[PDB]
Scaffold this active site. Sequence first.
Site, PDB file in Angstrom:
ATOM      1  N   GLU A 175     -51.510  27.840  39.032  1.00  0.00           N
ATOM      2  CA  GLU A 175     -51.469  26.388  39.192  1.00  0.00           C
ATOM      3  C   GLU A 175     -52.048  25.737  37.933  1.00  0.00           C
ATOM      4  O   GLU A 175     -52.736  26.403  37.168  1.00  0.00           O
ATOM      5  CB  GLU A 175     -52.311  25.978  40.416  1.00  0.00           C
ATOM      6  CG  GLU A 175     -51.822  24.753  41.205  1.00  0.00           C
ATOM      7  CD  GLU A 175     -52.939  23.766  41.649  1.00  0.00           C
ATOM      8  OE1 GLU A 175     -53.419  23.814  42.813  1.00  0.00           O
ATOM      9  OE2 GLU A 175     -53.330  22.892  40.835  1.00  0.00           O
ATOM     10  N   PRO A 235     -38.901  25.782  48.110  1.00  0.00           N
ATOM     11  CA  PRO A 235     -38.961  24.702  49.064  1.00  0.00           C
ATOM     12  C   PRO A 235     -39.213  23.329  48.451  1.00  0.00           C
ATOM     13  O   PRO A 235     -39.479  22.368  49.193  1.00  0.00           O
ATOM     14  CB  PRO A 235     -40.162  25.096  49.930  1.00  0.00           C
ATOM     15  CG  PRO A 235     -41.068  25.790  48.997  1.00  0.00           C
ATOM     16  CD  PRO A 235     -40.174  26.523  48.045  1.00  0.00           C
ATOM     17  N   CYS A 236     -39.149  23.209  47.130  1.00  0.00           N
ATOM     18  CA  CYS A 236     -39.663  21.971  46.530  1.00  0.00           C
ATOM     19  C   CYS A 236     -38.686  21.083  45.755  1.00  0.00           C
ATOM     20  O   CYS A 236     -38.294  20.037  46.252  1.00  0.00           O
ATOM     21  CB  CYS A 236     -40.965  22.238  45.765  1.00  0.00           C
ATOM     22  SG  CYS A 236     -40.849  23.483  44.478  1.00  0.00           S
ATOM     23  N   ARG A 237     -38.311  21.464  44.538  1.00  0.00           N
ATOM     24  CA  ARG A 237     -37.262  20.726  43.826  1.00  0.00           C
ATOM     25  C   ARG A 237     -36.317  21.674  43.161  1.00  0.00           C
ATOM     26  O   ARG A 237     -36.745  22.636  42.545  1.00  0.00           O
ATOM     27  CB  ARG A 237     -37.832  19.759  42.795  1.00  0.00           C
ATOM     28  CG  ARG A 237     -38.428  18.491  43.403  1.00  0.00           C
ATOM     29  CD  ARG A 237     -37.397  17.580  44.051  1.00  0.00           C
ATOM     30  NE  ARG A 237     -38.000  16.348  44.556  1.00  0.00           N
ATOM     31  CZ  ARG A 237     -38.382  16.148  45.829  1.00  0.00           C
ATOM     32  NH1 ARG A 237     -38.234  17.095  46.759  1.00  0.00           N
ATOM     33  NH2 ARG A 237     -38.912  14.987  46.179  1.00  0.00           N
ATOM     34  N   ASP A 261     -34.197  25.221  49.682  1.00  0.00           N
ATOM     35  CA  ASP A 261     -33.975  24.106  50.569  1.00  0.00           C
ATOM     36  C   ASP A 261     -33.653  22.904  49.711  1.00  0.00           C
ATOM     37  O   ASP A 261     -33.490  21.796  50.227  1.00  0.00           O
ATOM     38  CB  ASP A 261     -35.256  23.849  51.364  1.00  0.00           C
ATOM     39  CG  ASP A 261     -35.139  22.667  52.353  1.00  0.00           C
ATOM     40  OD1 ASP A 261     -34.308  22.740  53.278  1.00  0.00           O
ATOM     41  OD2 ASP A 261     -35.910  21.678  52.228  1.00  0.00           O
ATOM     42  N   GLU A 266     -29.549  17.470  43.393  1.00  0.00           N
ATOM     43  CA  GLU A 266     -30.230  16.346  44.083  1.00  0.00           C
ATOM     44  C   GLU A 266     -31.061  15.497  43.128  1.00  0.00           C
ATOM     45  O   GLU A 266     -31.564  14.430  43.484  1.00  0.00           O
ATOM     46  CB  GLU A 266     -31.164  16.852  45.194  1.00  0.00           C
ATOM     47  CG  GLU A 266     -30.484  17.501  46.375  1.00  0.00           C
ATOM     48  CD  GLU A 266     -31.467  18.177  47.290  1.00  0.00           C
ATOM     49  OE1 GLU A 266     -31.596  19.415  47.211  1.00  0.00           O
ATOM     50  OE2 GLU A 266     -32.129  17.481  48.076  1.00  0.00           O
ATOM     51  N   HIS A 292     -31.914  20.693  52.520  1.00  0.00           N
ATOM     52  CA  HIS A 292     -33.084  19.806  52.398  1.00  0.00           C
ATOM     53  C   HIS A 292     -33.639  19.384  53.750  1.00  0.00           C
ATOM     54  O   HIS A 292     -33.912  18.209  54.015  1.00  0.00           O
ATOM     55  CB  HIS A 292     -32.811  18.573  51.515  1.00  0.00           C
ATOM     56  CG  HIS A 292     -34.036  18.062  50.820  1.00  0.00           C
ATOM     57  ND1 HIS A 292     -34.024  17.612  49.513  1.00  0.00           N
ATOM     58  CD2 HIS A 292     -35.321  17.970  51.237  1.00  0.00           C
ATOM     59  CE1 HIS A 292     -35.244  17.250  49.162  1.00  0.00           C
ATOM     60  NE2 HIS A 292     -36.054  17.471  50.185  1.00  0.00           N
ATOM     61  N   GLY A 294     -36.431  20.579  54.889  1.00  0.00           N
ATOM     62  CA  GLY A 294     -37.874  20.747  54.785  1.00  0.00           C
ATOM     63  C   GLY A 294     -38.726  19.941  55.765  1.00  0.00           C
ATOM     64  O   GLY A 294     -39.644  20.487  56.379  1.00  0.00           O
TER      65      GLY A 294
HETATM   66  N1  LIG Z   1     -38.327  20.506  50.898  1.00  0.00           N
HETATM   67  C1  LIG Z   1     -38.892  19.287  51.032  1.00  0.00           C
HETATM   68  O1  LIG Z   1     -38.425  18.460  51.803  1.00  0.00           O
HETATM   69  C2  LIG Z   1     -40.151  18.915  50.285  1.00  0.00           C
HETATM   70  C3  LIG Z   1     -41.179  18.350  51.034  1.00  0.00           C
HETATM   71  C4  LIG Z   1     -42.372  17.999  50.413  1.00  0.00           C
HETATM   72  C5  LIG Z   1     -42.514  18.228  49.045  1.00  0.00           C
HETATM   73  N2  LIG Z   1     -41.513  18.779  48.315  1.00  0.00           N
HETATM   74  C6  LIG Z   1     -41.734  18.982  46.857  1.00  0.00           C
HETATM   75  O2  LIG Z   1     -42.809  19.904  46.551  1.00  0.00           O
HETATM   76  C7  LIG Z   1     -43.677  19.324  45.568  1.00  0.00           C
HETATM   77  C8  LIG Z   1     -45.113  19.780  45.748  1.00  0.00           C
HETATM   78  O3  LIG Z   1     -45.529  19.521  47.088  1.00  0.00           O
HETATM   79  P1  LIG Z   1     -47.102  19.408  47.376  1.00  0.00           P
HETATM   80  O4  LIG Z   1     -47.222  18.505  48.574  1.00  0.00           O
HETATM   81  O5  LIG Z   1     -47.712  20.789  47.398  1.00  0.00           O
HETATM   82  O6  LIG Z   1     -47.535  18.641  46.036  1.00  0.00           O
HETATM   83  P2  LIG Z   1     -49.053  18.600  45.540  1.00  0.00           P
HETATM   84  O7  LIG Z   1     -49.168  17.459  44.577  1.00  0.00           O
HETATM   85  O8  LIG Z   1     -49.971  18.718  46.730  1.00  0.00           O
HETATM   86  O9  LIG Z   1     -49.212  19.947  44.701  1.00  0.00           O
HETATM   87  C9  LIG Z   1     -48.563  20.041  43.443  1.00  0.00           C
HETATM   88  C10 LIG Z   1     -49.076  21.351  42.909  1.00  0.00           C
HETATM   89  O10 LIG Z   1     -48.257  21.919  41.868  1.00  0.00           O
HETATM   90  C11 LIG Z   1     -49.153  22.235  40.767  1.00  0.00           C
HETATM   91  N3  LIG Z   1     -48.590  21.981  39.441  1.00  0.00           N
HETATM   92  C12 LIG Z   1     -48.272  20.763  38.942  1.00  0.00           C
HETATM   93  N4  LIG Z   1     -47.776  20.887  37.685  1.00  0.00           N
HETATM   94  C13 LIG Z   1     -47.796  22.205  37.370  1.00  0.00           C
HETATM   95  C14 LIG Z   1     -47.420  23.029  36.207  1.00  0.00           C
HETATM   96  N5  LIG Z   1     -46.904  22.456  35.088  1.00  0.00           N
HETATM   97  N6  LIG Z   1     -47.601  24.365  36.301  1.00  0.00           N
HETATM   98  C15 LIG Z   1     -48.120  24.952  37.400  1.00  0.00           C
HETATM   99  N7  LIG Z   1     -48.482  24.267  38.498  1.00  0.00           N
HETATM  100  C16 LIG Z   1     -48.337  22.922  38.540  1.00  0.00           C
HETATM  101  C17 LIG Z   1     -50.298  21.254  40.858  1.00  0.00           C
HETATM  102  O11 LIG Z   1     -51.401  21.737  40.087  1.00  0.00           O
HETATM  103  C18 LIG Z   1     -50.473  21.149  42.350  1.00  0.00           C
HETATM  104  O12 LIG Z   1     -51.211  22.265  42.805  1.00  0.00           O
HETATM  105  C19 LIG Z   1     -43.564  17.827  45.767  1.00  0.00           C
HETATM  106  O13 LIG Z   1     -43.824  17.084  44.578  1.00  0.00           O
HETATM  107  C20 LIG Z   1     -42.127  17.670  46.190  1.00  0.00           C
HETATM  108  O14 LIG Z   1     -41.321  17.431  45.045  1.00  0.00           O
HETATM  109  C21 LIG Z   1     -40.339  19.125  48.914  1.00  0.00           C
END
Ligand SMILES: NC(=O)c1ccc[n+]([C@@H]2O[C@H](COP(=O)([O-])OP(=O)(O)OC[C@H]3O[C@@H](n4cnc5c(N)ncnc54)[C@H](O)[C@@H]3O)[C@@H](O)[C@H]2O)c1
Lengths: 329, 329
Positions: A175, A235-237, A261, A266, A292, A294
């Site tokens: 992280e 699960p994220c982007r 997901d 997108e 998506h 999630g």
């Molecule tokens: N599937 C879905 O519907 C869904 C739902 C919620 C979130 N998401 C995506 O997941 C992302 C993260 O979710 P979250 O709630 O854990 O966010 P968060 O802000 O709680 O956590 C982000 C984490 O990623 C780490 N990070 C950031 N930049 C980094 C880098 N360059 N290298 C390594 N680590 C890095 C940060 O240090 C932090 O720990 C969201 O921004 C969102 O885009 C997707």
Amino acid sequence: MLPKLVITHRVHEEILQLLAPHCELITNQTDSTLTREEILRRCRDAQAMMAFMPDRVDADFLQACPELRVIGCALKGFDNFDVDACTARGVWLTFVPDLLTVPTAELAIGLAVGLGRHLRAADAFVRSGKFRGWQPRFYGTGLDNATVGFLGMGAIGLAMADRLQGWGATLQYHEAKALDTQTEQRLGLRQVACSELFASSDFILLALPLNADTLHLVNAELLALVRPGALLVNPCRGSVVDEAAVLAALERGQLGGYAADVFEMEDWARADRPQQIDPALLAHPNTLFTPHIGSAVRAVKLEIERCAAQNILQALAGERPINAVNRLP
Amino acid sequence: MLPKLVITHRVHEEILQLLAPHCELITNQTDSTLTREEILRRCRDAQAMMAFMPDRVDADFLQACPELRVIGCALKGFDNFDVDACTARGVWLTFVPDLLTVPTAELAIGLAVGLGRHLRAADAFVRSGKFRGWQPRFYGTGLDNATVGFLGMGAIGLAMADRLQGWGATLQYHEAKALDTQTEQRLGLRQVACSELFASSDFILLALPLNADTLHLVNAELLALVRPGALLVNPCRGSVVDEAAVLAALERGQLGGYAADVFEMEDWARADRPQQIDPALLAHPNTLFTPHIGSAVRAVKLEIERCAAQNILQALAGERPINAVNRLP
Ligand SMILES: NC(=O)c1ccc[n+]([C@@H]2O[C@H](COP(=O)([O-])OP(=O)(O)OC[C@H]3O[C@@H](n4cnc5c(N)ncnc54)[C@H](O)[C@@H]3O)[C@@H](O)[C@H]2O)c1
Ligand SMILES: NC(=O)c1ccc[n+]([C@@H]2O[C@H](COP(=O)([O-])OP(=O)(O)OC[C@H]3O[C@@H](n4cnc5c(N)ncnc54)[C@H](O)[C@@H]3O)[C@@H](O)[C@H]2O)c1
């Protein structure tokens, strides 16, 4: 005379009833998402916006809506909303920091298992009526004794680690911000360098936002380091991974599977966004996909909507919205 | 002359090299399972049998195999073996009490999440090439805040509960024998009665063995009690449920969904088993199936073979086998 709020997608009956006294509602109570044009049209002299995943707000947008005071996002990753351009034009930008975490963590874990155990092919085989009794094939990969690595350890990262506590895995992570040492200790989590993360994990779970620095972070360079058979879950982007490098990694058989997901298609804020998911990826048997979903849990939607609602209301009452992402007066 | 041992299925080379020094092995290192008639012919004068899930041993089998001293089972559910008949003729019957638990527990949680979130259909949707980004539909059921009822609380049910520890769910169970107070409060498990279990659970996870007492336990009566939308997950034996009753409950909309790794058709001992899974059940959208891959994890399969082999060896050396199921006078 009341402030005008444009809500781009269906929200619950109960949410409207909460907003209705304080602003006039330009709503979309259907299933579909409307064109960019039609949404710009509604927003022209709108003073508030409830925005969902398919919306993208840039300077050109904000420019044509001179009366906007708040955009309340029913989501966590605001990557398609130009925060700065918002701050520049005096628009509040708000998110939902917690409510999406859990259903998403639950899903990511189900994807891990689904992928590790060839759930698609297994299900298809049973359904084709060809299953007639116990046979030594479909060998899979479980979490017990596996090393599981997280890229990111924020909300979703910790919810996943929490849920993997009783599962007999070695948990490790990379992280930007370290976890405090107490939390690491509690959750049995070891801080490793990003490349060690990719070199030594049997399961790689993605948990980081999309932004300038994460765009395509998971590329051929990193995928090259993985144990043959390693399992990757997104699960994220979409755009934190390079889908083509993921596809090449599966085809050579180095990467054992890719579940996701979310998709590069997108990610509107990208000029060179793919228009579709590569059909060769959809066709690869060592994959698992969800569109998506999630945070597509019924009780949660109501809360997410409400969180975004309350934020909007606060903004329009001249307060700092409790979940602003950006900074103003 | 060495005691003769019949292995009815392929085993790892390593397992042959442990056994062959004590026994003359009549092996089956092909991919197929053999006829009852063929296995009987081989067992006519064997002193031992290593058995697997296609094997079924009744009184007439033992009667045709006078020399048999032990039947070592490469499995946990001995429902296809008549233990009393074994005991009567001086034949040890052993099994494998733990090696299968965890992979099976991991699978069941996976099927739970999979079924709750409409994963089969989700993946079809994405793979069809018509994903156009997020939408306000496809919506599903999470474990956070749900009540999860286990029926059975032995090896598997505990492993499932272990694995649900951080998940925000209220855990309940009904067993043939209560759990002790400590384990109860350790895992957050409340004991309830069977009918109450089925009336008040969002997820029902089956975790009991097949025997005359449990045969068709999950029947029309019980299913008529469920909250509409309740999700049933069977990872143990097909016939602990009535699949026609399950289907009817799905077809009328009361049962939210059904997921299973096991099926009434595999229950060899059952004179009247269906010969296939009902095509209407395979066609039903609210299902998720896996083809008895509960323990289909390679590292584990070797271990399972080893456990049975050692059990078999202990018997031939005239010790009581560590994992005997019966006890000899
Ligand atoms: N599937 C879905 O519907 C869904 C739902 C919620 C979130 N998401 C995506 O997941 C992302 C993260 O979710 P979250 O709630 O854990 O966010 P968060 O802000 O709680 O956590 C982000 C984490 O990623 C780490 N990070 C950031 N930049 C980094 C880098 N360059 N290298 C390594 N680590 C890095 C940060 O240090 C932090 O720990 C969201 O921004 C969102 O885009 C997707
Ligand atoms: N799909 C697979 O690969 C797979 C793997 C392992 C086991 N199984 C099946 O799962 C079954 C149980 O597995 P386990 O290791 O947890 O066994 P176990 O013997 O440890 O557990 C049996 C549990 O079910 C309870 N039970 C028995 N009769 C009952 C009744 N009438 N009502 C309510 N509860 C009752 C018992 O009290 C005990 O808690 C096995 O018998 C086997 O058939 C399937």
